[PDB]
Amino acid sequence: GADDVVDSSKSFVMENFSSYHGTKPGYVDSIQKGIQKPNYDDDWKGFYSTDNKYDAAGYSVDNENPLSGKAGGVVKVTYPGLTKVLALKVDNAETIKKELGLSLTEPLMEQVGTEEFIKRFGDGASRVVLSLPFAEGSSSVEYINNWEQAKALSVELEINFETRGKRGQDAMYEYMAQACAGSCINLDWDVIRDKTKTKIESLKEHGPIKNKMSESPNKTVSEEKAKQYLEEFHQTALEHPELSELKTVTGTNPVFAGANYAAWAVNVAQVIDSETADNLEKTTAALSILPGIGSVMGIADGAVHHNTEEIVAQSIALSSLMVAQAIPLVGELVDIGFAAYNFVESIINLFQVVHNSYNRPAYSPGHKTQPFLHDGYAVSWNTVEDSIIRTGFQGESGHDIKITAENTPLPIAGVLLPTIPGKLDVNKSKTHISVNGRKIRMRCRAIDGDVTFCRPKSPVYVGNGVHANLHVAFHRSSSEKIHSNEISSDSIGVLGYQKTVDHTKVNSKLSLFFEIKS
Amino acid sequence: GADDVVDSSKSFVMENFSSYHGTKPGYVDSIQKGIQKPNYDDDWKGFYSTDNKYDAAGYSVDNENPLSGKAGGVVKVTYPGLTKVLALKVDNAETIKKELGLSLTEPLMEQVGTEEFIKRFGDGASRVVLSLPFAEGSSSVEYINNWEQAKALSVELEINFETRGKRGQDAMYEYMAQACAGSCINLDWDVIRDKTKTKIESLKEHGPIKNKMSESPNKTVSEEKAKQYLEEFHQTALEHPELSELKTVTGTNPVFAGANYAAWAVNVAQVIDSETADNLEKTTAALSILPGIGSVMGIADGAVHHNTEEIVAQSIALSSLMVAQAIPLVGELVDIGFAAYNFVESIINLFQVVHNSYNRPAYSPGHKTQPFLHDGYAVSWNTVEDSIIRTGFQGESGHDIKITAENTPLPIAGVLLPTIPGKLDVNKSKTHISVNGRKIRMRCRAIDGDVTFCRPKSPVYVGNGVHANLHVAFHRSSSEKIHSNEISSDSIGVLGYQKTVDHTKVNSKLSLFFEIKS
Amino acid sequence: PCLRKYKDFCIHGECKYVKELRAPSCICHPGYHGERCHGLS
Amino acid sequence: PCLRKYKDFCIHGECKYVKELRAPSCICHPGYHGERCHGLS
């Protein structure tokens, strides 16, 4: 059954099939002459490319020093004549060979290169290239070329990061930022490096800073008393004119509090030692497994708040001055050289990794199967289809929402359902919540014509070991499709316990966003 | 296509098909004479029963006063002769009729009662009964009987709660507790009612209590200052000999702290008013949407810690005395009558609901698709199949684990994979984590022969808007099935940031439990 | 009650008093979230 | 290192020092969880 493993919708033949390849450093010039060959699944031996040059870029780092090496480049490889791209529904070679009726006793990619396979599944092309979804959470695909067929490729250079001779991996990430800059963080790290250096020296030569630097006990102390110094040093340091903009964007969000920079400074001091502090790979390595970084990065609530070269520089500068105060209080090394040197370099690298994550497309909390985590609860659509509300027909549809809580028993007061009378109304009887098997019916009631409210008949609690599934049933009386202007809200509001938000008693709202389709 | 909507594996014919039905109060005697007939989907008009008498019990409450009414009973209904149970793969009548080729212009349950349907799908029986999974998260099924065919049923009584004349719904929950008592909380609420009453009066007549009762400002005050009084009152009250056992089981867990009973007392005071305080339904209603109840229930970490009549009584007693102190400080009613009266009754009812949840079978955090929520992270198996590791064959298998974090950027240091050499080893190359589309490879390494450790090549952070999918690939060299004794660990340890647990720096472990099968 | 007492409570959403629970609510406009529909995403 | 320094750290699990991260770890026995494999579930 070829229809069982080959996704024909995504399979096709084209003239001059082109793709991209991430080229490690030192291989940029050599690869521009031809594709040449040098696991537990011998079947996938082959040359790998991708339909996305930006993803391809990601693969241009030293496999030796993966965290903080230098970048190589990206090349565009093209096949002359016709090439068949056979997209696959699975990545299990054994299962593929069975369903495709092949030699179960030989590697898969080698059979993909034989004329027998190129004849049968080739639909005309000179060679075949396997195509599998790049990864979970992406639209890009991964092209697996047969080693033999791949010598036929024509390599042309697209970008060369090493050629830009830029610090760390700046060139590489500057390139990837283009993906969205056609949120979208497109920063100039050179500028950020400049501003940071300038500010670190300015802070050091500031009266109050020096003044506070003296109040430092300067020898190892308990981390409880250390934080208190750093927090005070923080408040003081943040007063400096150079850091004016940080003082402002920082005063509101708790994540960005001085206590947070303080605990961060201490964490760093505790894990870096003379050995580590000397090596860039080793440092970045230690730093990357520490919590509280969003505090210095200005990342919280699904957003990168430190969106400018100016603020980014100010945050790193402050973090570096703090780390320098922290080292003698609980560290064990050459007290400061690290803070303005390696620490800045590693941290800059981590910022770049996280910024890259936010620039990439993604589903927000409550969308598709992504959980929405709020006030101790964790809700999400059972499946992607559940998040999709179809229209243009008369009839029912049901929607499952997984709900649970982190620990102690938390209530579920009821649920708010957006409605469009005639095209989308709540089926009051096919709608319920089941808590650990207990199917509990709900008392629904159209508050407005815009929203119905359903409340469980018997109390509903969720927690560690107590999960529930809310089943929203919709009914359509008109076979006319819902029109955009009609959509007054695109989410289902599950209500938790009663809290006090800005002086008003309201219930915790956990949102499950949906999409109207068909 | 009948095979598309009828689950034949769960379909069958049997002599004297019997099932259970939850009977509302006032209908216990009448229903024992015969099944007689009295939504948006007219198709499911019918008499509903279930294969589980305990679930059936749940449905014996006043539909009028669903939260705290009285219980009716359960009856066993049997069909004479042969009955065909046609289990269905879906609950969409329209889809069922199409695939079963029926009149799309008439209700479903009515066609299920016609001889035409009883002939075709009946496989011999006199009538057919539809069977659908009771709910999500249960093994019980729901039987939908045709109204006509159901007069043929023979009703025999199983249990009558109203006949036990027990307070609230005690009879009903005592019955349900039997489900596990063949954790398993099987309490004697009569005893708990006794002990609570005795303790409330003993506390009231205790010197220190009266002594502290006087330090009460007795008129409305800020809730900040109110808590402080209640917390002090708490510490004092907890000293009383009657509450010795509570003082002990409470001193360790933070959830059970005096601050927690204090904030609870205040919450209650703030939502109950003269109207509410007078009605049992209205009270229980208000109470049920308040957080912090696990504090008085002694529920936390997936366990009901207040497992005895004695401790349960002590907790409720203390909670009642506190609520009485709280009322004048922020309430607005007949100051106390409520606390020893209605409050105790409602709270007792809520305890019963939650205890019932823990007695019911359920998947713990990290099992099947249930998320494991720890240190800000939220991980879980992408699908149920992912949580199942098969054996008894040579070859691969892949396993997806959804990972994310509530807010700020949290790291993923790497992952610990349990292994059984020869039967289950890590496929180092088919194993990776993809963060928002970015496929990141991993450096794996057998620490022991018992566990391999994989670390991401480039740093991995997850958070609000940054999700990831860890793909563990397993390889089998022996076609011999893994034997129980061999299984030295049944979970995958995803490591988060580095914390300090009991003096040792360790990484946050988020566990995904699996099952070896086939 | 959304007119008088709970006016301006809801930011990016429509105010609807939920009688049963005796509290206002905010039906967040497309893409917004929050008790007061303060944020987008 | 599990012998000397990190002895008794792991409750219901086997201690394994993870060199890369420079810290011990506990491979929880069937059904246990926790950094120290303290709890069942």
mmCIF file of C-alpha atoms in Angstrom, chain A residues 39-41 44 58-59 63 66-67 91-92 134-138 142 172-173 255 270-271 285 288-291 293-294 299-302 350 353-354 356-358 360-363 365 369-371 373 378 396 402 404-409 411 413 426-430 434-439 443 455 457-459 461 464-467 469 475 497-498 505 507, chain B residues 39-41 44 58-59 63 66-67 91-92 134-138 142 172-173 255 270-271 285 288-291 293-294 299-302 350 353-354 356-358 360-363 365 369-371 373 378 396 402 404-409 411 413 426-430 434-439 443 455 457-459 461 464-467 469 475 497-498 505 507:
data_model
loop_
_atom_site.group_PDB
_atom_site.id
_atom_site.type_symbol
_atom_site.label_atom_id
_atom_site.label_comp_id
_atom_site.label_asym_id
_atom_site.label_seq_id
_atom_site.Cartn_x
_atom_site.Cartn_y
_atom_site.Cartn_z
ATOM 1 C CA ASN A 39 23.832 5.299 12.723
ATOM 2 C CA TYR A 40 21.452 2.670 14.181
ATOM 3 C CA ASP A 41 19.312 2.987 11.017
ATOM 4 C CA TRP A 44 18.967 6.844 6.014
ATOM 5 C CA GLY A 58 21.083 26.820 11.752
ATOM 6 C CA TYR A 59 23.114 23.795 10.699
ATOM 7 C CA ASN A 63 29.614 20.091 15.484
ATOM 8 C CA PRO A 66 27.840 23.422 19.013
ATOM 9 C CA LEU A 67 26.811 26.003 21.622
ATOM 10 C CA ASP A 91 10.012 7.775 8.997
ATOM 11 C CA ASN A 92 10.244 4.032 9.801
ATOM 12 C CA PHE A 134 11.406 18.872 9.009
ATOM 13 C CA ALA A 135 10.169 18.637 12.552
ATOM 14 C CA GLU A 136 7.151 18.819 14.795
ATOM 15 C CA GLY A 137 5.987 22.437 14.854
ATOM 16 C CA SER A 138 7.361 23.454 11.476
ATOM 17 C CA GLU A 142 13.656 17.721 5.144
ATOM 18 C CA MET A 172 24.182 33.634 11.297
ATOM 19 C CA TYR A 173 21.451 35.004 13.519
ATOM 20 C CA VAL A 255 10.082 39.171 36.395
ATOM 21 C CA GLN A 270 27.805 29.639 42.060
ATOM 22 C CA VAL A 271 28.357 27.682 38.867
ATOM 23 C CA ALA A 285 27.191 25.560 28.815
ATOM 24 C CA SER A 288 22.296 27.772 29.758
ATOM 25 C CA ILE A 289 20.948 25.425 32.453
ATOM 26 C CA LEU A 290 20.223 28.208 34.946
ATOM 27 C CA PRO A 291 16.729 29.642 35.558
ATOM 28 C CA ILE A 293 17.401 34.393 32.534
ATOM 29 C CA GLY A 294 14.180 35.846 31.191
ATOM 30 C CA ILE A 299 11.253 38.045 28.270
ATOM 31 C CA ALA A 300 7.936 37.230 29.883
ATOM 32 C CA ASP A 301 4.268 36.698 29.027
ATOM 33 C CA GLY A 302 5.021 35.450 25.508
ATOM 34 C CA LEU A 350 21.802 32.744 24.763
ATOM 35 C CA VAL A 353 18.989 31.574 20.753
ATOM 36 C CA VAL A 354 15.864 32.664 22.588
ATOM 37 C CA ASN A 356 15.404 33.141 17.414
ATOM 38 C CA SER A 357 12.708 31.047 19.074
ATOM 39 C CA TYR A 358 10.277 34.000 19.284
ATOM 40 C CA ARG A 360 9.877 31.518 14.540
ATOM 41 C CA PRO A 361 6.213 30.842 13.944
ATOM 42 C CA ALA A 362 4.484 29.105 16.822
ATOM 43 C CA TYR A 363 1.122 28.416 18.381
ATOM 44 C CA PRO A 365 -0.947 29.101 24.737
ATOM 45 C CA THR A 369 -2.847 21.482 21.225
ATOM 46 C CA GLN A 370 -0.706 23.986 23.131
ATOM 47 C CA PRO A 371 -1.676 24.148 26.790
ATOM 48 C CA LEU A 373 -1.178 27.536 31.839
ATOM 49 C CA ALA A 378 -3.499 23.616 32.572
ATOM 50 C CA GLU A 396 -23.506 19.109 15.240
ATOM 51 C CA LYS A 402 -8.395 18.673 28.572
ATOM 52 C CA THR A 404 -6.278 19.855 35.030
ATOM 53 C CA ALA A 405 -4.320 21.579 37.837
ATOM 54 C CA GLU A 406 -0.746 21.352 39.165
ATOM 55 C CA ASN A 407 -1.383 20.313 42.770
ATOM 56 C CA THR A 408 -4.163 21.152 45.284
ATOM 57 C CA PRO A 409 -7.843 20.830 44.270
ATOM 58 C CA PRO A 411 -12.479 24.463 40.996
ATOM 59 C CA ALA A 413 -17.015 27.379 38.066
ATOM 60 C CA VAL A 426 -24.687 25.428 22.184
ATOM 61 C CA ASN A 427 -26.274 21.998 22.186
ATOM 62 C CA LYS A 428 -27.246 22.148 25.825
ATOM 63 C CA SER A 429 -27.599 18.356 26.185
ATOM 64 C CA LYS A 430 -24.527 17.071 24.281
ATOM 65 C CA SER A 434 -16.319 14.389 32.885
ATOM 66 C CA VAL A 435 -14.069 14.390 35.987
ATOM 67 C CA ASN A 436 -12.083 11.112 36.323
ATOM 68 C CA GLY A 437 -14.852 9.174 34.603
ATOM 69 C CA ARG A 438 -17.694 10.970 36.338
ATOM 70 C CA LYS A 439 -19.853 12.429 33.578
ATOM 71 C CA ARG A 443 -26.788 23.862 33.228
ATOM 72 C CA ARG A 455 -22.209 25.589 34.867
ATOM 73 C CA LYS A 457 -24.501 20.455 38.082
ATOM 74 C CA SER A 458 -22.231 18.946 40.740
ATOM 75 C CA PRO A 459 -19.017 20.786 41.834
ATOM 76 C CA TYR A 461 -12.351 20.175 40.970
ATOM 77 C CA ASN A 464 -2.799 16.387 40.754
ATOM 78 C CA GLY A 465 -4.469 13.078 40.005
ATOM 79 C CA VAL A 466 -7.811 14.634 39.121
ATOM 80 C CA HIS A 467 -8.289 15.462 35.504
ATOM 81 C CA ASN A 469 -12.543 16.672 29.880
ATOM 82 C CA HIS A 475 -25.229 23.031 16.715
ATOM 83 C CA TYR A 497 -11.767 29.964 41.080
ATOM 84 C CA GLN A 498 -12.816 33.468 42.104
ATOM 85 C CA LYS A 505 -14.102 39.793 41.954
ATOM 86 C CA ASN A 507 -13.058 34.128 37.932
ATOM 87 C CA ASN B 39 -32.831 18.387 23.140
ATOM 88 C CA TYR B 40 -31.026 19.806 20.069
ATOM 89 C CA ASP B 41 -30.446 16.214 18.865
ATOM 90 C CA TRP B 44 -31.045 10.374 21.223
ATOM 91 C CA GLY B 58 -24.087 9.455 40.900
ATOM 92 C CA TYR B 59 -27.216 10.176 38.880
ATOM 93 C CA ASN B 63 -31.886 17.721 39.218
ATOM 94 C CA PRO B 66 -27.833 19.177 42.073
ATOM 95 C CA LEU B 67 -25.039 20.303 44.408
ATOM 96 C CA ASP B 91 -21.886 9.872 18.813
ATOM 97 C CA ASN B 92 -22.928 11.911 15.736
ATOM 98 C CA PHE B 134 -19.547 6.613 29.253
ATOM 99 C CA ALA B 135 -17.075 9.444 29.172
ATOM 100 C CA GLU B 136 -13.506 10.418 28.471
ATOM 101 C CA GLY B 137 -11.347 8.891 31.200
ATOM 102 C CA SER B 138 -13.618 5.988 32.064
ATOM 103 C CA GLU B 142 -23.456 4.280 28.472
ATOM 104 C CA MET B 172 -24.751 7.754 48.174
ATOM 105 C CA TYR B 173 -21.059 8.403 48.644
ATOM 106 C CA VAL B 255 -0.418 23.709 51.738
ATOM 107 C CA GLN B 270 -16.094 37.541 51.808
ATOM 108 C CA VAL B 271 -18.531 35.537 49.718
ATOM 109 C CA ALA B 285 -22.462 26.956 45.496
ATOM 110 C CA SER B 288 -17.206 25.502 45.564
ATOM 111 C CA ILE B 289 -15.666 28.252 43.406
ATOM 112 C CA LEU B 290 -13.115 29.304 46.027
ATOM 113 C CA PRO B 291 -9.436 28.260 45.936
ATOM 114 C CA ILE B 293 -9.778 24.200 49.881
ATOM 115 C CA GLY B 294 -7.150 21.501 49.563
ATOM 116 C CA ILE B 299 -5.203 17.245 49.742
ATOM 117 C CA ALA B 300 -1.963 17.899 47.913
ATOM 118 C CA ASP B 301 0.622 16.155 45.733
ATOM 119 C CA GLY B 302 -1.901 13.687 44.297
ATOM 120 C CA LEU B 350 -17.322 19.249 48.850
ATOM 121 C CA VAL B 353 -16.999 15.190 45.887
ATOM 122 C CA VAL B 354 -13.224 15.463 45.871
ATOM 123 C CA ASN B 356 -14.869 10.567 45.150
ATOM 124 C CA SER B 357 -12.542 11.886 42.457
ATOM 125 C CA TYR B 358 -9.453 10.314 44.089
ATOM 126 C CA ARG B 360 -11.905 6.807 40.846
ATOM 127 C CA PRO B 361 -9.260 5.343 38.588
ATOM 128 C CA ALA B 362 -7.125 7.931 36.844
ATOM 129 C CA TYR B 363 -3.830 8.479 35.098
ATOM 130 C CA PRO B 365 0.830 13.236 35.999
ATOM 131 C CA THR B 369 -1.456 12.065 27.789
ATOM 132 C CA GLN B 370 -1.675 13.598 31.266
ATOM 133 C CA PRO B 371 0.746 16.484 31.673
ATOM 134 C CA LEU B 373 3.531 19.990 35.816
ATOM 135 C CA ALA B 378 4.569 21.216 31.491
ATOM 136 C CA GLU B 396 12.805 1.001 15.854
ATOM 137 C CA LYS B 402 5.470 17.768 24.301
ATOM 138 C CA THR B 404 6.776 23.774 27.430
ATOM 139 C CA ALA B 405 6.846 26.309 30.304
ATOM 140 C CA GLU B 406 4.300 28.696 31.856
ATOM 141 C CA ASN B 407 6.035 32.042 31.326
ATOM 142 C CA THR B 408 9.724 33.112 31.358
ATOM 143 C CA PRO B 409 12.318 31.153 29.331
ATOM 144 C CA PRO B 411 16.023 25.563 29.995
ATOM 145 C CA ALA B 413 19.560 20.551 30.128
ATOM 146 C CA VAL B 426 18.745 4.676 22.238
ATOM 147 C CA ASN B 427 19.006 5.322 18.523
ATOM 148 C CA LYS B 428 21.417 8.194 18.914
ATOM 149 C CA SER B 429 20.667 9.669 15.466
ATOM 150 C CA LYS B 430 16.847 9.383 15.274
ATOM 151 C CA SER B 434 12.664 20.517 17.942
ATOM 152 C CA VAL B 435 12.064 23.983 19.463
ATOM 153 C CA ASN B 436 9.481 26.007 17.455
ATOM 154 C CA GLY B 437 10.491 24.251 14.248
ATOM 155 C CA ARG B 438 14.207 24.290 14.961
ATOM 156 C CA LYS B 439 15.336 20.668 14.836
ATOM 157 C CA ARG B 443 24.700 14.336 21.988
ATOM 158 C CA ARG B 455 22.052 16.664 25.757
ATOM 159 C CA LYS B 457 23.729 20.508 20.822
ATOM 160 C CA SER B 458 22.446 24.092 20.931
ATOM 161 C CA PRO B 459 20.763 25.465 24.122
ATOM 162 C CA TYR B 461 14.544 27.015 26.238
ATOM 163 C CA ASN B 464 5.141 31.117 26.874
ATOM 164 C CA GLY B 465 5.195 31.030 23.093
ATOM 165 C CA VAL B 466 8.152 28.666 22.899
ATOM 166 C CA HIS B 467 7.291 25.027 22.768
ATOM 167 C CA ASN B 469 8.911 18.284 21.012
ATOM 168 C CA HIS B 475 16.134 0.452 18.878
ATOM 169 C CA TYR B 497 17.197 24.023 35.194
ATOM 170 C CA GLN B 498 19.630 23.428 38.048
ATOM 171 C CA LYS B 505 22.663 20.771 43.091
ATOM 172 C CA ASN B 507 18.282 19.428 37.766
#
